[PDB]
Design an enzyme around this catalytic site. Structure first.
Site: not given
Ligand SMILES: Cc1cc2oc(=O)cc(CP(=O)(O)O)c2cc1C
Ligand SMILES: Cc1cc2oc(=O)cc(CP(=O)(O)O)c2cc1C
Length: 270
Positions: A47, A82, A107, A109, A145, A212, A214
């Site tokens: 992200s 999300w 974050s 989506n 994806e 962030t 993830t």
């Molecule tokens: C697949 C996914 C897992 C995520 O698991 C997290 O623990 C935190 C987020 C928010 P991010 O850290 O990406 O901003 C997160 C986002 C996605 C798309």
């Protein structure tokens, strides 16, 4: 070269305990000193591209007055897992600025995909990054994806160094006009998703903005930030991780620990 050598062994031990790879680049904008560890390797953006996406929107708003206040309506099919803010405005729409804040600070989506559409897709964001001098960044796919984080796949990756250099240009340099620069900083300062990453390494009396990422697989997660310690120039830094097995879990504590080491290497007492 000296500061990078100071923390080379602690970085190697940290990533060995983590069981994957850690990439770090940190820049003291006062002296110009830097700390690097795997700083030129590619890591998945996850992200973290959403911060640069909002900066690209702000850059376009310099040429397109009223872009930020433009309402965007969307259907249920635009929602992505999300999408915590955009799902609450499904029946009303949101402005471009609201989508940008949601993408940066939650974050979100669906917000990210809607803004990508406005900017011409992954190639359009990549083109913006090229326009500020970043030849490393590439976005190739959409949410979700782009999170595949496949070992060896260069799609949807950048390097910690390029992330930090671009972040510096957009938050402290001249890549954005002054009002847009402060708006980008303010969005990063208000991020809600990074309390356990770089922010966990930063004393309470320092200002920090971060974004962030993830991916959810391959031990892959990251954070980049601008940090304003009191009494000295700001620090810009990026911490990216990945691991060899799909089922490997990322670690927020490892990201925080890597940020601590980078600040220590720069001589920033924190
Ligand atoms: C697949 C996914 C897992 C995520 O698991 C997290 O623990 C935190 C987020 C928010 P991010 O850290 O990406 O901003 C997160 C986002 C996605 C798309
Ligand atoms: C989204 C975007 C893509 C871009 O891709 C380019 O190739 C050149 C620029 C800079 P411009 O030519 O508009 O000054 C650019 C700007 C934005 C916001």
């Amino acid at each position: 070269h000296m500061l990078t050598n100071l923390v080379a062994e602690p970085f190697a031990k940290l990533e060995q305990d983590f069981g994957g790879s850690i990439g770090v680049y940190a820049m003291d904008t006062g002296s110009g000193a830097t700390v690097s560890y795997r700083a030129e390797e590619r890591f998945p953006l996850c992200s973290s591209f959403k911060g640069f996406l909002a900066a690209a929107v702000l850059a376009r708003s310099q040429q397109q007055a009223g872009l930020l206040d433009t309402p965007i309506r969307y259907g249920k099919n635009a929602l992505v897992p999300w999408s915590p803010i955009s799902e609450k405005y499904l029946t009303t729409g949101m402005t471009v600025a609201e989508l940008s804040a949601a993408a940066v600070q939650y974050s979100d989506n669906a917000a990210a995909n809607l803004l990508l559409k406005e900017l011409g897709g992954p190639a359009g964001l990549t083109a913006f990054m090229r326009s500020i001098g970043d030849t490393t960044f590439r976005l190739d796919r959409w949410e979700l994806e782009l999170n595949s984080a496949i070992p060896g796949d260069a799609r949807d990756t950048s390097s910690p160094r390029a992330v930090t250099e671009s972040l510096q240009k957009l938050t402290l340099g001249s890549a954005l006009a002054a009002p847009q620069r402060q708006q980008f900083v303010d969005w990063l300062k208000g991020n809600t998703t990074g309390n356990h990453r770089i922010r966990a390494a930063v004393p309470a009396d320092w200002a920090v903005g971060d974004k962030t990422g993830t991916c959810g697989v391959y031990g892959t997660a990251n954070d980049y930030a601008v940090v304003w310690p009191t009494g000295r120039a700001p620090i810009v830094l990026a911490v990216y991780t990945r691991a060899p097995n799909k089922d490997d879990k990322h670690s927020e504590a490892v990201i925080a620990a890597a940020a601590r080491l980078a600040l220590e290497g720069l001589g920033v007492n924190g």
